Each structure stands twice: as structure tokens, then as C-alpha cells.
Design a protein around this ligand. Sequence first.
Ligand SMILES: *[C@@H]1O[C@H](CO)[C@@H](O[C@@H]2O[C@H](CO)[C@@H](O)[C@H](O)[C@H]2NC(C)=O)[C@H](O)[C@H]1NC(C)=O
Lengths: 49, 37
Amino acid sequence: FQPTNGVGYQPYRVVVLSFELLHAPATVCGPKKSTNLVKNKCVNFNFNG
Amino acid sequence: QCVNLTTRTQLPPAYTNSFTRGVYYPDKVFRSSVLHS
Ligand SMILES: *[C@@H]1O[C@H](CO)[C@@H](O[C@@H]2O[C@H](CO)[C@@H](O)[C@H](O)[C@H]2NC(C)=O)[C@H](O)[C@H]1NC(C)=O
């Protein structure tokens, strides 16, 4: 790792994000507002994705 | 800290017939009456 080196030798910080779905009650969720839950209505539900 | 316990009788390991036990839930999915393989 030297600054005098050209393209192809510079250090690159790599972060790999991994996750499993549909196997356990999730806790991490994206930013989305929660609306009121109606009971007897044909609606488009979205529970944890 | 370690203490080597002595004065222990040496016996051969015994065995028994494990009956129909050890069944666990493979997943957290609720199932009412489906015979899931
Ligand atoms: C309990 O027994 C073990 C087994 O011999 C002892 O571990 C030995 O310790 C000596 C001294 O440090 C080593 O030279 C041997 O190589 C060890 N043997 C093994 C198999 O690891 C242990 O010291 C004993 N503990 C007490 C409190 O007497």
C-alpha cells in the first residue's frame, strides 16, 4: 500500500452485507410509516415485508 | 485451580433403546393439520 502506486494497487475497503429472510421474527426494518389496521376490509396488507 | 478427582470406580458404558423422542420444530411456521414432510 503506497500512494505512488497506480490504479490496481490501492487499498479498497469492502463491506459485505448478508441477511436471511422468512425464517425468524425480524427486528430490523426500513423506514416506513405504520397506518391504522382495519379489520373487515379487503386491503393490501404489508406485515414485515 | 484444577483439581483431578480420584477414587472413581471404572464401569463399562451402558446403553438403552431411544424411543420415539427428539422431535423438534424445524421452522417457526404455524401449521394446523398439514402432514408436512
Ligand atoms: C490432571 O491430569 C492431567 C493429565 O495428566 C495433568 O496434565 C498434565 O500436566 C503435566 C504438567 O503440566 C504435563 O506435563 C502433562 O503433559 C499433562 N498431561 C496432559 C494429558 O495434558 C494435570 O496436570 C493434572 N492436574 C492436577 C491438578 O494434578
